[PDB]
Design a protein around this ligand. Structure first.
Ligand SMILES: [Mg+2]
Ligand SMILES: [Mg+2]
Ligand SMILES: [Mg+2]
Ligand SMILES: [Mg+2]
Ligand SMILES: [Mg+2]
Ligand SMILES: [Mg+2]
Ligand SMILES: [Mg+2]
Ligand SMILES: [Mg+2]
Ligand SMILES: [Mg+2]
Ligand SMILES: [Mg+2]
Ligand SMILES: [Mg+2]
Ligand SMILES: [Mg+2]
Ligand SMILES: [Mg+2]
Ligand SMILES: [Mg+2]
Ligand SMILES: [Mg+2]
Ligand SMILES: [Mg+2]
Ligand SMILES: [Mg+2]
Ligand SMILES: [Mg+2]
Ligand SMILES: [Mg+2]
Ligand SMILES: [Mg+2]
Ligand SMILES: [Mg+2]
Ligand SMILES: [Mg+2]
Ligand SMILES: [Mg+2]
Ligand SMILES: [Mg+2]
Ligand SMILES: [Mg+2]
Ligand SMILES: [Mg+2]
Ligand SMILES: [Mg+2]
Ligand SMILES: [Mg+2]
Ligand SMILES: [Mg+2]
Ligand SMILES: [Mg+2]
Ligand SMILES: [Mg+2]
Ligand SMILES: [Mg+2]
Ligand SMILES: [Mg+2]
Ligand SMILES: [Mg+2]
Ligand SMILES: [Mg+2]
Ligand SMILES: [Mg+2]
Ligand SMILES: [Mg+2]
Ligand SMILES: [Mg+2]
Ligand SMILES: [Mg+2]
Ligand SMILES: [Mg+2]
Ligand SMILES: [Mg+2]
Ligand SMILES: [Mg+2]
Ligand SMILES: [Mg+2]
Ligand SMILES: [Mg+2]
Ligand SMILES: [Mg+2]
Lengths: 207, 21, 159, 171, 294
RNA sequence: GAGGUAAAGCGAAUGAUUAGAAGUCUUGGGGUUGAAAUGACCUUAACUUAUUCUCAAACUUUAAAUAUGUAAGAAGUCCUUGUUGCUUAAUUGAACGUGGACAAUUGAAUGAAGAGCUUUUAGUGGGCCAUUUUUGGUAAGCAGAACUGGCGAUGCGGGAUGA
RNA sequence: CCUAAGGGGGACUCAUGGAGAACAGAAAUCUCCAGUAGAACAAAAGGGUAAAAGUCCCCUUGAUUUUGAUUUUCAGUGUGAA
RNA sequence: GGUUGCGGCCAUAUCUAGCAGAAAGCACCGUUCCCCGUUCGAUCAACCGUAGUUAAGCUGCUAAGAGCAAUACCGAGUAGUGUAGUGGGAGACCAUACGCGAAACUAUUGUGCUGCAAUCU
């Protein structure tokens, strides 16, 4: 049925997504990309840990699903279902093709899905508390076994899923420049309608 | 006599979208 | 099935510029083209009559014939190991005066002006153009600008 | 000044619609009723497309409508408001300051009844506007109307209550 | 969905400045202005005819890249100098403006003795014919702008005046008042009636014996000059003659100088705030917003 | 001058796509408080608003590198006025001209066993390989294109050996 | 495939959204506002198009005659088309 | 300098919401015998300039306004890329050498200029 994963590791063809030109494409095995306590506020989980690709490579949707399941199972088993928020950061949009007379009319049919990842591209991100660091790292390290190639586990300099360092976030928070938005936050802008900006951020200490 | 407008450009029987629940 | 029609592969070449579709600004129709003028060719997709072939989009040539709404332009096209003289009839919507004349025609006047004035002063002037030459010697003052020492920085991850 | 003479509300036009669901003699008799009421030749509207449920087809002459302006529009409007006994609802006024109602029998207006004609219901719509709407309707230099000069629901409601001594419900 | 997003404004392509104003029909403008490329820099000359609520503007224009250049111009408000003081927007006032602009342009050119025009206006359709062994008549094309082409429109009054004044303006008579569409011939009698204000005089006569109060309100200026219908024609008939005697343009004497006008207008109209002023405004609005902190 | 590929973008159009948050009078349903009220409520799902993760050979505002068209004068630039059945309202222009002015730094570099021209005829019309770009294919000492350089057609030193 | 779906001129603005009007309802017809084209343009797709090339109206046959030049494919041969 | 007619470039000119507008101009505005077009003198046509108004159009100003335009010890000499090696690496790919070199992002500034004719406190 399914060929060995070694047949589709490298980005040899141009991107081939589902479209109006290929229509009979199956669905990716991964459908859920956010796990754990995804409704947790930004302030609850300051520590972010990434699983980063050190390869220009293709990861199948099957491998993504397997790694997601492994990491989620381990972390909920060790620390509880509400101790983390796991996010899969690569979406499989590239369609693989299978052919099987001979080489005549050999354009293949859709066979599976893979995400094309670059070097330094984040594959999985996990926001949690500091005390659960050693757990979350081991959750990603096991998931590494389900992937081909080399991956690195990198502790982020930033607060959770924000683009601000762990010191700039505190500065923008004590300055009233950050408000909650559910699982994410909104930052203050010094452009646009002054009244709407002021209304959205009441605690803004202007200088 | 009187009527001659329809400044639109309609397709076939096109009961327009709408037509749902 | 192979496809090779007249306007094949001109999807982006013959597009109007972004936020510039529609009516032609009328300076295009008020310009006056004379035989011997140098003109750039750029097909306007919204006028399909007197339209150039896709080869001439981006080519520059000499006007040889002027008609009611069109000009004839002479282009030299490579066919194998030589050039062939092509005579294309183009409506004036696809044509604009070439800016290479205005640079060279100004240098002729400037050279003429320089020649007459040195002659007035009974001296000489050199009109040949020169490529950029290596720079001369110079002295760098350090008052307020004492050199600051730099070093390569260590490696960090910012993700 | 908001109390300017040119800010005076007044009727722009009245449009009378009879959407008889079929084509032929009945639509013609509705057109006869409209020509009787307005004194002007009305215009018949054709269905824009086909619906089998309503028994209509594209380009089948379905409805008939007519536009009246001036004193005759005012006379027809009060003749129709008598049938409504001068009582509309708040829901009946659009955000652009236009309003409408629908009578159910055309003999209540005050015209002779004919057995051949029968009775048709009728739809009334009044288009409101201040002076200067020609800006939006002229050919050359067409522009938009300023915000204070715009017609809205509240101004039209108050003007209607004042000019007709009627009641605007809200059920 | 909110429709007017920032992306909607980003991708909107504004039309030509004078098209968004609704003043120039660029289709018609392109067809009128564009000149045969083999006639090079010889310009096409346009008869721009525009009607305001009180005035008729007729100009002879040639177009260039830096902008149009006016050759001559005749306005309807010049008419009081020639003896027409009221009804400056008649069809006949249009005829008078066309005749005036034709004579003024020909005076500027030098084609006065040649191409006098139709000196005896009988209402017959006629085109300015070229003189053998002589310069061709000044050729001009009609530019009615956004105004609709209707049989009886006032723009063709300027047309007929300019045609009768000696300018060559190509046209047909099926848009003149008095054209019988059923019997495709021109009733030159009715056209001649319209040229000399006959319809207005007939309105005066018909209103005076029917609604005297309305005649008193509509035709006030006529009442205080004691000008009746029977001498209406003379008002035009003399004016025509006067227009041909001295068609030169005489500018109005200005009660103030250009500098005085500029200083007076410059006293009004607000001037933009400095960056610092609006920064201070923003700071004040921020401080005064602290009172609704709840 | 032309271009629309790489990169880039998606709180920009189109199309795909993950997650919450706050709202609204077609909320789409379950249980209410209902006697009904639909008049509220608990809930889930929709949309809307400001955000969020990830994408495109047959998407795109922007937009390279390499490559590509034209020009760099004497057949040039300027002045005056001749020809015509073409053109202008014209004594306006168009083209081709008579007469006059601008002298070797005559208007970039570099090179040039010098430039231009004609006739006639052979063989050939199975190709293949290497870097880089690249399509089908799991792939292949597989099949197919782009630019250049090579082998064929070529010996010589090296790669033991080898188109 | 089309006597218009060709040609000329003129008037209008399309898809769509919001708010309103007896029967009338998600869908009949009418009204205002909004509406950069999100429609439509015979057809496959791309391009192009808004006082238009779209919708509607009026008049027409330039879808005519004589033969050359030219563009593309190109050997700078033919055919088709322009 | 204001305003009108005709324009060039075609948003630094557009969009939203407020506020102001002397003179003239423009505008709204009044009327339906006549030329003319409509279901409707609403649009178009004609007449009056006579009865009225700056409410609107138009113009200017305001907005940590949207958009747009311009600039850069912004990001970034990053991504990409011409050229080179008997460079690294099993590979995927990566580093280096002589050259070329973005976009997003960020910050700041700005928000039509102008030609011909006419006219005006
Ligand atoms: Mg491949
Ligand atoms: Mg096949
Ligand atoms: Mg691994
Ligand atoms: Mg093909
Ligand atoms: Mg293009
Ligand atoms: Mg054609
Ligand atoms: Mg026109
Ligand atoms: Mg370039
Ligand atoms: Mg391409
Ligand atoms: Mg790409
Ligand atoms: Mg999207
Ligand atoms: Mg990418
Ligand atoms: Mg740029
Ligand atoms: Mg010659
Ligand atoms: Mg040598
Ligand atoms: Mg041979
Ligand atoms: Mg042979
Ligand atoms: Mg042979
Ligand atoms: Mg052989
Ligand atoms: Mg190869
Ligand atoms: Mg091969
Ligand atoms: Mg083989
Ligand atoms: Mg290549
Ligand atoms: Mg080699
Ligand atoms: Mg050889
Ligand atoms: Mg060798
Ligand atoms: Mg050897
Ligand atoms: Mg070896
Ligand atoms: Mg047609
Ligand atoms: Mg048209
Ligand atoms: Mg609208
Ligand atoms: Mg077909
Ligand atoms: Mg057509
Ligand atoms: Mg034929
Ligand atoms: Mg034929
Ligand atoms: Mg050929
Ligand atoms: Mg051929
Ligand atoms: Mg005033
Ligand atoms: Mg009126
Ligand atoms: Mg009118
Ligand atoms: Mg005002
Ligand atoms: Mg701004
Ligand atoms: Mg090796
Ligand atoms: Mg480099
Ligand atoms: Mg970009």
């Amino acid at each position: 049925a399914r060929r060995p994963a070694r047949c589709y590791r490298y980005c040899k063809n141009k991107p081939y997504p589902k479209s109006r030109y290929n229509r009979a494409v199956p669905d990716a095995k991964i459908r859920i990309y956010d796990l754990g306590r995804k409704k947790a506020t930004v302030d609850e989980f300051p520590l972010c840990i990434h699983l980063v690709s050190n390869e220009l490579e293709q990861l199948s949707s099957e491998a993504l699903e397997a790694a997601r399941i492994c990491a989620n199972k381990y972390i909920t088993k060790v620390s509880g279902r509400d101790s983390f928020h796991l996010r899969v950061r690569v979406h499989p949009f590239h369609v693989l093709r299978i052919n099987k007379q001979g080489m005549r009319g050999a354009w293949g049919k859709p066979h599976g899905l893979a995400a094309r990842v670059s070097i330094g591209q984040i594959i999985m991100s996990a926001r949690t508390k500091d005390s659960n660091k050693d757990v979350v790292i081991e959750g990603l390290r096991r998931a590494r076994y389900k992937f081909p190639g080399q991956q690195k586990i990198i502790i982020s300099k930033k607060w959770g899923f924000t683009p601000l360092n762990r010191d700039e976030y505190i500065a923008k928070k004590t300055n009233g420049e950050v408000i909650d938005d559910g699982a994410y936050v909104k930052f203050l802008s010094r452009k646009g309608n002054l009244e709407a900006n002021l209304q959205q951020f009441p605690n803004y200490q202007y200088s | 006599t009187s009527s001659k407008k329809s400044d639109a450009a309609p397709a076939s029987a096109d009961p327009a979208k709408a037509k749902k629940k | 099935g192979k496809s090779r029609g007249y306007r094949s592969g001109t999807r982006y070449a013959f597009q109007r510029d972004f936020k510039k579709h529609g009516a032609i600004p009328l300076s295009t129709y008020l310009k006056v083209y004379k035989v011997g003028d140098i003109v750039d060719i750029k097909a306007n997709g919204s006028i399909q009559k007197g339209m150039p072939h896709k080869y001439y989009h981006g080519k520059t040539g000499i006007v040889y014939n002027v008609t009611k709404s069109s000009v004839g332009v002479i282009i030299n096209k490579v066919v194998g190991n030589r050039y062939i003289e092509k005579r294309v009839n183009l409506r004036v919507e696809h044509v604009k005066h070439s800016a290479c004349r205005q640079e060279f025609l100004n240098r002729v006047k400037s050279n003429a002006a320089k020649k007459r004035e040195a002659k007035a002063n009974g001296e000489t002037v050199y009109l040949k153009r020169q490529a950029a030459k290596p720079r001369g010697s110079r002295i760098i003052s350090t008052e307020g600008n004492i050199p600051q020492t730099l070093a390569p920085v260590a490696y960090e991850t910012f993700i | 000044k908001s109390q300017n003479v040119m800010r005076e509300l007044r009727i722009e036009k009245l449009v009378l619609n009879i959407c008889v669901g079929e084509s032929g003699d009945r639509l013609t008799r509705a057109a006869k009723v409209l020509e009787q009421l307005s004194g002007q030749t009305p215009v018949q509207s054709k269905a824009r497309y086909t619906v089998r449920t309503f028994g209509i087809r594209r380009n089948e002459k379905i409805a008939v409508h007519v536009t009246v302006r001036g004193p005759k529009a005012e006379e027809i409007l009060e003749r129709g408001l008598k049938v409504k006994e001068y009582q509309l609802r708040s829901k009946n006024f659009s955000a652009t300051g236009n309003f409408g109602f629908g009578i159910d029998e055309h003999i209540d207006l005050g015209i002779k009844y004919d057995p051949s004609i029968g009775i048709y219901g009728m739809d009334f719509y009044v288009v409101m506007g201040r002076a200067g709407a020609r800006v939006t309707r002229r050919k050359r230099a067409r522009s938009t109307i300023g915000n204070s000069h715009k017609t809205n629901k509240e101004d039209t409601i108050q003007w209607f209550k004042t000019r007709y001594d009627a009641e605007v419900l809200d059920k | 969905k909110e429709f007017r997003t920032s992306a909607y404004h980003s991708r909107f392509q504004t039309p030509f400045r004078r098209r968004q104003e609704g003043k120039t029909d660029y289709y018609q403008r392109k067809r009128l202005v564009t000149q045969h490329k083999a006639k090079y820099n010889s310009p096409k000359y346009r008869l721009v005819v525009r009607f305001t609520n009180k005035d008729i503007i007729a100009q002879i224009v040639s177009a260039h890249i830096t902008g149009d250049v006016v050759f001559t111009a005749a306005y309807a408000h010049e008419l009081p100098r020639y003896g027409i003081k009221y009804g400056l927007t008649n069809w006949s006032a249009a005829y008078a403006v066309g005749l005036l602009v034709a004579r003024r342009a020909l005076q500027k050119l030098g084609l006065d003795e040649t191409y006098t025009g139709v000196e005896e206006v009988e209402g017959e359709f006629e085109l300015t014919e070229a003189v053998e062994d002589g310069p061709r008549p000044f050729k001009v094309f009609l530019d009615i702008g956004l105004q609709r082409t209707t049989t009886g429109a006032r723009v063709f009054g300027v047309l007929k005046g300019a045609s009768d004044g000696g300018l060559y303006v190509p046209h047909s008579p099926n848009r003149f008042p008095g054209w019988d569409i059923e019997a495709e011939e021109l009733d030159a009698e009715l056209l001649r009636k319209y040229i000399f204000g006959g319809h207005v005089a007939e309105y005066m006569e018909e209103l005076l014996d029917d609604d005297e109060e309305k005649y008193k309100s509509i035709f006030k200026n006529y009442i205080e000059e004691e000008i009746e219908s029977e001498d209406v024609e003379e008002i035009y008939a003399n004016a025509h003659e006067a227009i041909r005697a001295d068609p030169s343009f005489k500018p109005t004497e200005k009660k103030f100088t250009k500098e005085q006008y500029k200083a007076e207008s410059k006293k009004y109209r607000q001037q933009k705030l400095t960056r610092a002023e609006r920064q201070a405004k923003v700071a004040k609005k921020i401080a005064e917003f602290k009172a609704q902190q709840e």
